[PDB]
Structures are given as structure tokens and as C-alpha cells.
Nucleic acid binder design. Structure first.
Ligand code: ASW
Ligand code: ASW
Ligand code: MG
Ligand code: MG
Ligand code: MG
Ligand code: MG
Ligand code: MG
Ligand code: MG
Lengths: 668, 655
DNA sequence: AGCCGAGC
DNA sequence: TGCAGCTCGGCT
DNA sequence: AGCCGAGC
DNA sequence: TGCAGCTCGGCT
């Protein structure tokens, strides 16, 4: 079921240079293109669908170029020849089509695909672009009307000088990473400032269109310092909070639900894989998985590649999630809008830097991000130290349930070791692989070549048996004692490849202001998170004091009303809204306190009059007095606490449950 | 599909080895996993990704090209025609046993049967040695045992094309024995008659629609979800499928929902006479009979305005909603105001029975329902397809001729302006006009040229011919020559009746009459329910009006009195315990909350006046309703539906 | 020989 | 019920 | 010569 | 982003 060409009738014959090959984004668009052309259109227009991102040929290997489906189909269809230059009219007589018309989604990923296509032709046949060989096109009845007016939707790329060569090269050469950081830096800065046509050159296309994809790539791929999330991830968590599921949801159904509630504009299978990623809890994945892995979500045996299909596995929130992201704090977040639907916030504000717990990592354009896992209790403890004006201890990466060793070689430089021990003089036991070394891989890339030997080396070991579980590693290895002697004389950890380095010189993240920023040490990250989170505890307090104050005023008025009613001092019986409103005002009743507070962020006495008739009864009077006083005491107790104290209460509540859950995990 | 061959497979311990066939990759994954380290020596795992070929009467070419069959043959080293009677013969096999490991559900069992069918047909001897076993979900290993000729009959009964009438009797008996009831080794015979029959039956339940609403359970779940969701904006189909799956506890692949949803939204000539979902996007055309629908991820839908008009919301109160795992789901059926099983032409393929019904005109059905409300006999009906421009005429009992349109323009030219229903434009072009133009290896060219002037929803061919050929064509009969006549035969109108029983209907009038009697009494039930409910509301309002009035005239006080004292006081003064709660109770101390929950606003002048007005309006509302007959209520509905039908259908002709 | 459609 | 290769940067 | 993951 | 072949009964 590979992609299928619908070849123009006149292709490869007398009228080849008059034929256009339409390259579309996916097969639906191919079907619609074909029906919009109709029978008369099929003469000079072919259609072939590209099913996703294609090879960057500029510095790909010869193998990749030879073996690539899309690249090679384009060549056969068009009749291109490597190394041929198309300078003359004469040279063009060997082509089956005279131009390619790119027809992709009018979105950023669409633009990326135009780029890769441009990159392709530019790298191999620049002499073609001089002839103007590339064009773009920017319900089946709607597709027919579009095509009858083809010329009005048809843009022609023009080559206009070396500035085009440089633009294309800037965007796609592996040698141009630093130029792209500069390019995008100028873009990003230029954009925060502003906050305060038949022909299209390649230069303009790169700098006015493709750059939008490049910036979007960064926005979806590089996590926020604040909550450790990428936008898709944040959309999943937002949906899960809103749904509040108390039994397991199938992952595919959760995916679709996230897509609806959060206005997710991409393929739901990306959402699915993301969900699987958030739930994983095997060694080297998440230190705290926010979703529960209910079913086969992958094991350390294959690094999670052995997860079952999203249609057959289930998940729900961890009991730790709302402890980490307290509900009350949602009141302080800037929620985003998409199509005037309210969606996920700009960022959540967790009580500890989640960006460090689960080890953010993404690859963008210009930058990429990698951070290892850090230990949660160790981070809780440093937040506590900072809350008391003490210095934070330095911190080593730490991966939950990892039995091995992480040693600091230098700044952002670590050696990571598994565990091997000598049992007898014929036997070693391997009980830990280094973090991110998966069991099957180690077995086939290390133990097998040791058993069988290679052409380069003779067999070092004699036998090995496996006694693993789903979550632990046990290899028993037999060796002649002469052989054991040598391996032991060399490094055991060395000979058996149980040492890997870990290097973190690209801790790139979006700061709370949404600016892309490079962090030298996790200390910087912790400090920047800390000032912000402390500040937001100030806000939570301001918000609560205001709110609870209004609720107290509200209750004072309500209680006063009831009491005066039963005492005969007011009557409302058979009196006009007009007379009642003014009567309340003159008796000094406050307009709705909670509404007036919410606004500040005629007089309204509905809060009083909407009360039920039960309110006047004996028990309901006593109860309202108790509520009024309770609420008064609530406001005051809270005015006395500091933001630090609030933070500490959260920390204590989180840790308590982290103990239960993790203790539970070690027995389940 | 990847095999994981057993380490000792094909060698000398071949017969000690066991090939585990699974239903799906995740299953093979879990099986390869759970085999442990030592399991790799003696056990192979190979996944089947779904229903396999029924080889018992398949063509030679089918058997020869089938991926699953031939993979299993290679892996086990089976050889056609080779008898495996003795010890010697068994040496060639690379495995000694096949262990079938399917889902523990009906479809699972069906795959088991297809596998049994396959081995039994080609190598019956192999089963006499006990070749096959299963893993139900070491004490999970069940062995299939051949115990005599009654096992050959049981397998043949389930899988032979020659045994449709026997399956009919088979399933009939099962259905009766279950209806009356509603008050380790394993022989093949017992497998077929105790396990496989469960699939056969629920295959019918999911494939053959109900008479009452013309839905199958999957369709019905879609509708249920759509009503609950109540969308005002379009929804992506793929997302709607998942939403349906979740809200109605659907236990199958969501891609099937997606196609079902698409099938319900289609409105091209030949599909639905009234599409209940809207086709927002490319959902298919008459050009390709819908096979040109785009992907479910890129098309959208929402309810048609006619949906709640055909399935009035108030009627939901009379339905029997089912339960799946503590969760309340769709009803056993909806009760529409006209028989939808006839409008949209229900059709489905089961085991033993199938169902085919053609479409009937909606207005003609409304008129017939009107005649019946008057005690007249319904006019006979003919199949009728919205926007079909041809002719459908009776040839006999449940047999019809369906004709397209062709006419001679001049002595060289004919126009074809309509194709028989269900003849798709592209197919007609490739399979008729092209051969007629180019000739074939067999037939000669008939025409000299043709040109197309189709719109998206109509058909227009202009054909050129020499005078000689045209005359010959007229002689033979134009409709016959250009294949513009189809017959339609309807001797398989099988449906589930309102009571759950599978039934054959000889005439559409019988379906109509049955549906009518049922819908009429549900209007009886709707009236009863409305009178009781509006009634209780009126009592409620009276009491509230009475309290508010007594309070205002100081004849009662609640101020500072205890809850015990208040309730007693209300009882003494003859106030009623919650009337609406009492009536909902009778649908199978004193509650006065409906009074004391009223707000203090209730005591103010304008609110006193307003409550008085509402009380009187409710009394009149009860009376206006008691004055209407079940029959009058039905007629109101039909009038409203028809008004909207005209509006909708007129806007389509304009768009 | 293949279409119709709800399942794998 | 499953599966079909790439992009982009850092680093190994 | 390939892994990490959010996209097509 | 797509695509891979079958069951089952009644007809054409
Ligand atoms: C037996 O069923 C299948 C076998 C294979 N194997 S192979 C070697 O041909 O590739 C592959 C797929 C299936 N089953 C299929 C489906 C199963 C579940 C849900 C949808 C399916 N859609 C299919 C579409 C075409 C072909 C097989 C499908
Ligand atoms: C260029 O992208 C694709 C090309 C093909 N063509 S071919 C001849 O190899 O079969 C096929 C698929 C793709 N794109 C893919 C995806 C696109 C969107 C969403 C998920 C995709 N998953 C893929 C998985 C494997 C291979 C290609 C995929
Ligand atoms: Mg797109
Ligand atoms: Mg992770
Ligand atoms: Mg199943
Ligand atoms: Mg239909
Ligand atoms: Mg690379
Ligand atoms: Mg058949």
C-alpha cells in the first residue's frame, strides 16, 4: 500500500514541459486534487502524495539517498538525473514534467515540507530553479471550484541571486546550526518588540515563512522551566484535571478527548505516544510519573518500545498530581484561548521544579534540550533550605530505582555505572546496567559478541544465563579463570561496557516570560524556579485573603439579614423589588462582596435574597452563625501565615503521599 | 507479521514443540514475554491480525494467495493432500501441536473455529491424533478432542456454504432455548454448539437491525452519544467515535464506529433518504459509491435538525436504557415517529440470516401513517430513493425493475441522465461506456464517442454513435443495451421485532403495521406520563402558591421555629409531601423541601404575582394536554417533522 | 464475480 | 489488528 | 551510525 | 499521513 502516482496523460511525451506534477500532503488531499482536476485536468497534471516529512538530502548519507522512497519516486516520475545540469532548453527535453507544484497544508509543518522539497532540488539541480521549476498552490465540490480558478491560487518561486542560496543553506545545512541560533534569536527578539506576490523568492520564503515553522518547532519541542512541560504535555494534564477520572480511561480515547478539550491541532497518535511517555515508570523514564501506567506501557528490557497499542492500555492521574499542582493555584494561571474556547494555561506552577524531576528533553531548530532526572526528596529538601535562607546543596542526577552509580567528573559531566561483582573464579554477576542502557540491547550488542567473538576479537566469555524480572537485571556470566583474570585486571566495568558518560551542556528552556534561555547549571534553574514559585505563593495568599475576606463579609451580611428578619426588624413580605433594594441600601447592607472583589480583579443583593426559606429556621440560623464565625477565623489564621508556610504545608503533604505511593510500588 | 520460531522447531524434537497462534501482535508480545527464557525452546508465537479465510469452499486462487493460510502451512511444514495417519507421516511437521490463543470473546471464538475449519478440511487425520488445543483467559490448557462423526457434522454445520438452512434451524433452537430460560478436554461438537454459537448469535444481534428504529446496536450507540453531547458545532468524526466508545461502553475497534458514523451521514443518491448526521467534508459521492470518503481524522459531523424531530426527546422517558458495567448506556431501541427501518433501507449480514430493505419515501410513509390514524388501510408502497430520477416498477412479489434514463437526441446522439440506483458513475464509465468505445478482446465497439457533464450529485453522459448502430441499439432496447436496468429483489426482510425476536417479514406493509401498533401505544404511554408529570407539577405549584400566600397573610411563620415543629405544622395544615417526588416514586416521612427551598425572593410582590401566574398556567397546561389524544400528539409531531423536512430538503436543492 | 457493512 | 521513515541538535 | 520525542 | 483481506447471506 505504498503512495501511488496518478500520472498526467501527456507526461513523458511531446508535451512534457507543459505538465505539472502536484505533490500533496497526504492521500486525502491527493483525492481532492484529482477530483478537482476532473477528466480534462488529468491531461497535464499528475498527483503524488507525500505522507510526511521527507529526507534532508543536503548532508544525508549516500545510503539514505539511494534507499529513500520519496526522493526516488520523485526522480523517476519527473525523470531527473543526478549530476545533469539543466542550463539549456536542450537539457530539459529529458524530463517527463516541466514543473512541480507543491500543495501542502497551509500550516507550519506544511511549510517545512515545501522547504525540504526546495532543499532537495536546490542541492542537486540548482540550474533548474533558474528556469523556475517550482510552484506552490496556496468537500469535492469545493475542490472543483478551487481548480477552475487555479491560476489565482498559483504562486511561482523565483531564484533571485546568492541571497537565495544562503537562505536555503541557512535553513537546511548541518554546518549552519550557529547561524540558525542567530537567525531565530533575531526573529524572537523582533517579535517581542512589536508586541510592545505572484512570485516568491526563496530568500523571502525562508525568512518570512519557513522561520515560522522553526519557531513553532522550538515552542512544541523545548520545555518550559516553570513546569517542565511542552504544550502537548500541558494539554494532556489540563484535560486530565478537567475530566477528573476516578477509573481508568483507554489511552486512545483519552487522546481524542485531549484533542477536543484542549484544541489540539495535530495527529492524535502523537498525543497518544506523549501520554504513554508521561505514564512510563521503568528505570530511566520518569522519577514521578503523573499518569498511571495501567497495562503494558513498556519495560527497561526494550526501553519502552514494547508498549502495547494505545487502543489496549489505560491510564488515570497519579494521586501525586494534584499534590504537585495544587488546584487552588489554577486561579493564578493565565489560561489560553483557541477559537474562543478556553484551553490549557501558559504554564502550570508546580510546588517543586518538575523540569528537574523527570528530566526534560526536546529537539528543536537551532537548539535542543537535555536534562537528567533529579531526586524529588533531595529537591524538596533544597527548597526547604532556601526557604530558611540557607544555601542549596549541590545536586547529582538521580534515577528512581537505579542500583548503580552516578559520579560527577566535572561541571555537567557524569560517569554512570552499572554493577558487576565477582562471584567465584569462573563467574561474574551483572546486576545493574547504566541508566538508559536497555536489557535486550546490552545482551545483543555486548554479551553475544563476547560469547561468539567477532572477526576482530576472540570470545571472552564462555556462557551467560539471564534471571531478570520486568524491572530488574540479572546476568550470570561464566568465564575461564585466566579470562576472568584479564578482564578483572583491565576494568570489569570497562570490559563489560557498564560505564557511560552523561553530559549536560544544552540545558535550554523557555523562562517564565516565554523567552528561550540557556542555563549553565541546574542551580541556576532551581534558583530561577524558586524566586518565581515563592512569588506565586505570595499571590496565592493575596488571592485567598481577598476571596475569604469577601466570603466573610458576605456571611456577615447574610447573618445580619436573617437575624433582623426573625427579630421583626425587616419584613420583605409583599414588597416591590424597588422598595426592597432601597430598603437594604439604607440599612447599610453591602452589595455582593464576592462579585465586587471578582470585578476589582446597581447594588446586588441576590446573595441575600436567593437564600432558601430554610434559612429562617432554628437549626439553619445557628448553623449560619457558626459558618460566619468559622470563616472569620479562617481569614485571620491565614493573614498570619507567610507564603513560605503555605509552601511548606504543600511540601509536607506531597512528601507524605510520595512515601505511601512509593512504598506501595515496592510491594505491588 | 513476524514469526518467533521455537529453538527446537524443525529438528528432532519437532513433535515436542507447540506453535502458539495469537489474536494480534500485543498478544504475541505478551506471550513471547510470558514464555520466559526457557519457553523459547519449545514454543513458537505467530500473530493473526483478524478473521482468516474460510477455506472449505474458497476458490483455488483464494487458498493459494492467502497470507495467513500459507504462513501457517510453511511454519508447521504442512503439505496438502498428505495424509497423517501413522507415526512415519508426522516426522515432516516442524511442530507437533498448535495452540490457539484468542481473545476470550465471541470474535475470538470465531477465529478458533476458522482455524479448526482449516485443519479439519485439509487434514482431518491430524485431528484424530489431537493436533489442536487452546489457552483460555498450565491449568489454562484445554485440548480439542475428536470424538466421532458428530464432530464432522458440527464443524460442517458452522462453516459449510451448503448448510445455511441448517444454521437457520440451529440458531432458531438456540434463541428459543434462551428465551424460555429467561424466566480438561473439549470435543469439537461441544465447541461449536456451546461456544461458537454464541458468536453466531451475537453476530446477528450486531448485524441485523431492529424493526422499531431501524438501527443496529453500534448505530444506536452513535445516536445515543450524539443526543447526550448535543453539539452546536461540528465534531471531527475520529473524535466522535472515541467519544461514542467511551459514553456508550462500546467494546470493539473504534475504526468500525468511524465507518458507521460515515455511513449514517451519507446523502448521495442511493445512500440515506434522510441522513441523521451531517456530512461536513468529503464523505463520499455517487461517483464512487462513497469509497471516495476522506479519512475520519479530516471530516466532521453533527446532528441533522431532523433528528430530534424524528426521535422526540420527551419520548426518552419511555425507553429501556441498557447497562454495561455499572454505566448506563443506549436504549434497547428508540421509538421514532415514522418507521426509519423503511426510510433509510436497513441492511446487514449475519450468520444464518441476512437483511436487505430498500429505501421508501418519507412523505408517502407519513401519509400512510396518517391514513392508519384514521382507521383506513395503508396504500401499497414502492421503493423510493431521494433525488433518484429513474423508475422503479413492480415485477412481482418483492421484485422490482430499476431503470435509469436514456433518450435519443438525434440520429447520432443519446443522453444518459440517470443511472440505476446503486450504479456508481465511475463504475458505469469504466465497465460500460469504455468497453463500448474501445471494444474488448471479446465484444466490439458500439459507440464512437462519449462526453461527461456530471455535477457532483447528478449524472450526464452524451454518447455519439453512427445511425446504423443507434438503430440496432433501439431495436435491442436502449436500456438493455446500455445496462440501465437492474432488478431489486427483497425476499430477505429479516428484522428483530420489538420483543427481541428475529422475524422474517413478507411485505413492507407488515413491517409498517407492526411498527404502527407499537408507536401508537407509546403515544398512549407518552400521554400518560405527561399527564402524571404535569399533574404533579400543578399540585406542587398549588402548594407553593398556598404557602407563600399564607406566609404573607401572617397565617404562618417559620421564623426561628425548629425543623420538627415546621414539618408537623405543614402536615397539620394539610400540605402535601413532594408531589413530583411521590409520582416518580410510584413509577416502580413528609418531604417539604420543594416549599422551604424556595428563595426569599419568593415572598416579594412581583414574585408573588409571578408564582400565581405560573400556577394557573400549569393548570391550563394540564387541561390542554388531557384534551389531546395519543393520535393528536402523533399528528403534531408529523406536522412539525414535515415542516422541517421541507425546509431542509429545499435548502439542499439550493446549496 | 463481486457488492453490501460491522466486526477482527 | 497492526505496520510503513524521516526532521531537528547534542552527544556518543 | 543511532538515540532521545513531537511532529507529518 | 496512510494502507494491508477477510466473514457471513442474498442476491446481481
Ligand atoms: C487476517 O487479518 C489480517 C492479516 C494481516 N496479515 S498480512 C500478511 O496480510 O499483512 C494484516 C491485517 C489483517 N486484518 C485487517 C484488519 C484487522 C483489524 C482491524 C482492521 C483491519 N483492516 C484490514 C484492512 C486490510 C487488510 C487487513 C485488515
Ligand atoms: C514521508 O513520510 C512517509 C512516507 C511513506 N511512504 S512509503 C513508500 O515509505 O510507504 C509512508 C509514510 C510516511 N509517514 C509516516 C507517518 C506520517 C504521519 C503520521 C505517522 C507516520 N508514521 C510513519 C511510520 C513509519 C513510516 C512512515 C510514517
Ligand atoms: Mg497540518
Ligand atoms: Mg521522560
Ligand atoms: Mg476482542
Ligand atoms: Mg443505507
Ligand atoms: Mg542527526
Ligand atoms: Mg460469499
Amino acid at each position: 500500500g505504498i503512495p501511488k502516482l496518478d500520472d498526467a496523460n501527456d507526461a513523458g511525451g511531446k508535451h512534457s514541459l507543459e505538465c505539472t506534477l502536484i505533490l500533496t500532503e497526504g492521500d486525502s488531499a491527493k483525492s481532492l486534487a484529482v477530483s478537482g482536476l476532473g477528466v480534462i485536468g488529468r491531461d497535464r497534471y499528475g498527483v503524488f502524495p507525500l505522507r510526511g516529512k521527507i529526507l534532508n538530502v543536503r548532508e544525508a548519507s549516500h545510503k539514505q539517498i539511494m534507499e529513500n522512497a520519496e526522493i526516488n519516486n520523485i526522480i523517476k516520475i519527473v525523470g531527473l538525473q543526478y549530476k545533469k545540469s539543466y542550463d539549456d532548453a536542450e537539457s530539459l527535453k529529458t524530463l517527463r514534467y516541466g514543473k512541480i507544484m507543491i500543495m501542502t497544508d497551509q500550516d507550519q509543518d506544511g511549510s517545512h515540507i515545501k522547504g525540504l522539497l526546495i532543499n532537495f532540488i536546490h542541492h542537486n539541480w540548482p540550474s533548474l530553479l533558474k528556469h523556475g521549476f517550482l510552484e506552490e498552490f496556496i468537500t469535492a465540490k469545493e475542490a472543483k471550484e478551487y481548480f477552475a480558478d487555479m491560476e489565482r491560487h498559483r504562486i511561482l518561486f523565483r531564484y533571485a541571486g546568492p541571497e537565495d542560496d544562503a537562505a536555503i543553506t541557512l535553513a537546511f545545512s548541518k554546518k549552519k546550526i550557529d547561524d540558525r541560533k542567530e537567525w531565530l534569536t533575531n526573529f524572537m527578539e523582533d517579535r517581542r518588540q512589536r508586541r510592545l506576490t505572484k512570485h516568491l523568492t526563496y530568500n523571502d520564503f525562508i525568512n518570512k515563512e519557513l522561520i515560522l515553522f522553526s519557531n513553532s518547532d522550538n515552542e512544541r519541542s523545548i520545555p518550559s522551566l516553570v513546569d517542565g512541560f511542552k504544550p502537548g504535555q500541558r494539554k494532556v494534564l489540563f484535560t486530565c484535571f478537567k475530566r477528573n477520572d476516578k477509573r481508568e480511561v483507554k489511552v486512545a480515547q483519552l487522546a481524542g478527548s485531549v484533542a477536543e478539550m484542549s484544541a489540539y491541532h495535530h495527529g492524535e497518535q502523537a498525543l497518544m505516544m506523549t501520554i504513554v511517555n508521561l505514564a512510563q515508570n521503568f528505570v530511566g523514564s520518569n522519577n514521578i510519573n503523573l499518569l498511571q501506567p495501567i497495562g503494558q506501557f513498556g519495560t527497561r528490557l526494550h526501553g519502552g518500545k514494547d508498549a502495547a497499542s494505545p487502543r489496549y492500555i489505560f491510564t488515570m492521574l497519579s494521586t501525586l498530581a494534584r499534590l504537585l499542582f495544587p488546584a487552588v493555584d489554577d486561579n493564578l494561571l493565565k489560561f489560553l484561548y483557541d477559537d474562543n474556547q478556553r484551553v490549557e494555561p501558559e504554564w502550570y506552577i508546580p510546588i517543586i521544579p518538575m523540569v528537574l524531576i523527570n528530566g526534560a528533553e526536546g529537539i528543536g531548530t537551532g537548539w535542543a534540550c537535555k536534562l537528567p532526572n533529579y531526586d524529588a526528596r533531595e529537591i524538596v529538601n533544597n527548597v526547604r533550605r532556601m526557604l530558611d535562607g540557607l544555601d542549596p546543596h549541590p545536586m547529582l542526577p538521580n534515577y528512581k530505582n537505579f542500583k548503580g552509580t552516578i559520579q560527577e567528573l566535572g561541571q555537567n559531566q557524569y560517569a554512570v555505572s552499572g554493577e558487576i561483582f565477582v562471584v567465584d573464579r569462573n563467574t561474574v554477576e551483572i546486576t545493574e546496567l547504566p541508566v538508559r542502557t536497555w536489557t535486550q540491547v546490552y545482551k545483543e550488542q555486548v554479551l553475544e559478541p563476547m560469547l561468539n567473538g567477532t572477526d576482530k576479537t576472540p570470545a571472552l566469555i564462555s556462557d551467560y544465563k539471564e534471571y531478570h524480572t520486568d524491572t530488574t537485571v540479572k546476568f550470570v556470566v561464566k568465564m575461564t579463570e585466566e579470562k576472568l583474570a584479564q578482564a578483572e585486571a583491565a576494568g570489569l566495568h570497562k570490559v563489560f561496557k557498564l560505564q557511560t558518560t552523561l553530559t549536560c551542556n544544552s540545558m535550554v528552556l523557555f523562562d517564565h516570560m516565554g523567552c528561550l534561555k540557556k542555563y549553565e547549571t541546574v542551580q541556576d534553574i532551581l534558583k530561577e524556579f524558586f524566586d518565581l514559585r515563592l512569588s506565586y505563593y505570595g499571590l496565592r495568599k493575596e488571592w485567598l485573603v481577598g476571596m475569604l475576606g469577601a466570603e466573610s463579609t458576605k456571611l456577615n451580611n447574610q447573618a445580619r439579614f436573617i437575624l433582623e428578619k426573625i427579630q421583626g426588624k425587616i419584613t420583605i413580605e409583599n414588597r416591590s423589588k424597588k422598595d426592597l433594594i432601597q430598603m437594604l441600601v439604607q440599612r447599610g447592607y453591602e452589595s455582593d462582596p464576592v462579585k465586587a472583589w471578582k470585578e476589582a480583579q446597581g447594588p446586588d443583593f441576590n446573595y441575600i435574597l436567593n437564600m432558601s426559606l430554610w434559612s429562617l429556621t432554628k437549626e439553619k440560623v445557628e448553623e449560619l452563625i457558626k459558618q460566619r464565625d468559622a470563616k472569620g477565623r479562617e481569614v485571620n489564621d491565614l493573614k498570619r501565615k507567610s507564603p513560605s508556610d503555605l509552601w511548606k504545608e504543600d511540601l509536607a503533604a506531597f512528601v507524605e503521599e510520595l512515601d505511601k505511593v512509593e512504598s506501595q510500588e515496592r510491594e505491588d
